[PDB]
Design a protein around this ligand. Structure first.
Ligand SMILES: OC[C@H]1O[C@@](CO)(O[C@H]2O[C@H](CO)[C@@H](O)[C@H](O)[C@H]2O)[C@@H](O)[C@@H]1O
Length: 404
């Protein structure tokens, strides 16, 4: 009978790929359907290019794809419209904002799977060791705490120790980090939902100059090549006071044999001042049935299973990844394992989006301009002032004649 083939998530990032394959096999076993899992590269933008090869070829060789929240506008032609396969009540069990994100020109491209938001990880043991009672609320405080704790730990002999790690590599992760920096300095959303390219302003330039000031100082020099796992590895080995990362790092840091188990908390990222907005970049994944699948009915059943209450629960409990079902945030088991899901729920609800809605199918080109210009600041090649001006000009070129 049919073999249902899935590409989604990566065995190169935490437990996501291994867990995905497990869930797919569990569906196979439960329904008596053969399945295969195709692995993907770590970085989301590498995955887009890979999947685009299948799509260009109209390939039937993958039935279900896991897609990034930033992709619906790009991948819509390659998606089976799911709208006819779900009742309004079923669809209403997901966050409306994400169902809306996934709906392009009335086509429901994909089912919400997990959401995501950038957060601050911090070493509670080290904060207490150095006389601090709360994580930093401002970037200045983060800098001050990082400098003092680094000095003491280095003095105590940990030559691997840093104040702060984050994602500085030139790729989509850097777009995510940089939207947080810019937005939390009152610098806007880079490209506003209305289409205005707003990034050329003093607050955005300050934000980028501030991040350059971290490199080689409180953050390793090599942070300019760090993606999520590079940052997580330095953090998890116990060698960073602070990390900016996504929810998935929490379960991994708590696992048996993690050097930092029981020693950390999470909170909202800092901001430039009390009246700036909190910044948490919206992330997440959706489940798409391929328009080129020979088995749409079976693919849809798999997608419904993966997005179900109990699979999302398993993802929450075991991998500390955020449900797309509001009902899971009141589930006793989800909460007892991850109490911070409740504490940071409003942070997740107010997460700021990358400009994927307004850029649509040109989002990947916009994002590439953003991460390359940001990276030029992190490396000391350009000041933030020049970078935001050059970025404005690039984005204008890229989006000229695009209307939302
Ligand atoms: O594969 C799922 C896994 O990928 C991550 C990054 O490791 O996804 C987040 O980060 C991306 C940028 O690098 C964003 O584009 C994406 O939207 C966001 O979810 C993990 O957090 C997630 O578990």
């Amino acid at each position: 009978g049919p073999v249902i083939r899935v590409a989604g998530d990566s065995t190169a990032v935490g437990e996501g790929g291994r867990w995905m394959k497990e869930m797919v096999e569990a569906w196979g076993k439960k329904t008596g359907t053969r399945v295969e899992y195709i692995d993907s590269p770590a970085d989301t933008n590498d995955r887009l290019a890979l999947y685009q090869q299948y799509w260009a070829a109209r390939s039937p060789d993958v039935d279900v794809y896991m897609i990034d929240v930033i992709w619906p506008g790009i991948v819509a032609p390659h998606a089976l419209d799911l709208k006819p396969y779900l009742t309004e009540a079923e669809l209403k069990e997901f966050f409306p904002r994400i169902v809306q994100n996934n709906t392009i020109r009335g086509k429901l491209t994909s089912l919400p799977f997990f959401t995501d938001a950038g957060i601050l990880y911090y070493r509670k043991d080290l904060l207490e060791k150095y006389g601090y009672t709360s994580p930093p609320r401002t970037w200045n405080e983060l800098e001050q705490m990082a400098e003092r704790v680094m000095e003491g730990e280095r003095r105590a002999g940990n030559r691997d120790f840093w104040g702060f790690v984050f994602q500085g590599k030139p790729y989509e992760g850097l777009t995510c980090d940089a939207l947080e920096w810019i937005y939390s300095h009152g610098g806007g959303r880079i490209v506003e939902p209305d289409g205005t390219i707003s990034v050329n302003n003093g607050r955005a330039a300050l934000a980028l100059n501030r991040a350059h000031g971290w490199v080689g100082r409180i953050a390793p020099q090599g942070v300019t090549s760090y993606a999520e796992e590079e940052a997580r590895n330095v953090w998890q080995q116990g060698n960073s006071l602070f990390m900016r990362n996504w929810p998935y790092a929490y379960a991994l840091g708590q696992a048996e044999g993690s050097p930092i188990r029981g020693k950390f908390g999470v909170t909202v990222l800092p901001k430039a001042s009390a009246d700036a907005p909190n910044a948490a970049t919206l992330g997440g994944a959706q489940l798409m049935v391929s328009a080129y699948s020979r088995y749409p009915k079976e693919a849809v059943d798999l997608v419904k299973y993966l997005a179900s209450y109990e699979v999302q629960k398993d993802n929450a409990v075991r991998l500390s990844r955020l449900p797309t079902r509001p009902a899971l945030y009141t589930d006793r088991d989800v909460l007892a394992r991850n109490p911070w899901f409740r504490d940071l729920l409003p942070v997740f609800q107010n997460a700021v989006s990358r400009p994927s809605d307004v850029a649509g199918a040109r989002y990947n080109q916009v994002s590439e301009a953003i991460w390359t210009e940001v990276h030029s600041v992190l490396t000391g090649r350009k000041k933030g002032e020049q970078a935001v001006r050059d970025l404005e000009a690039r984005i204008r070129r890229i989006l000229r004649h695009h209307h939302h």
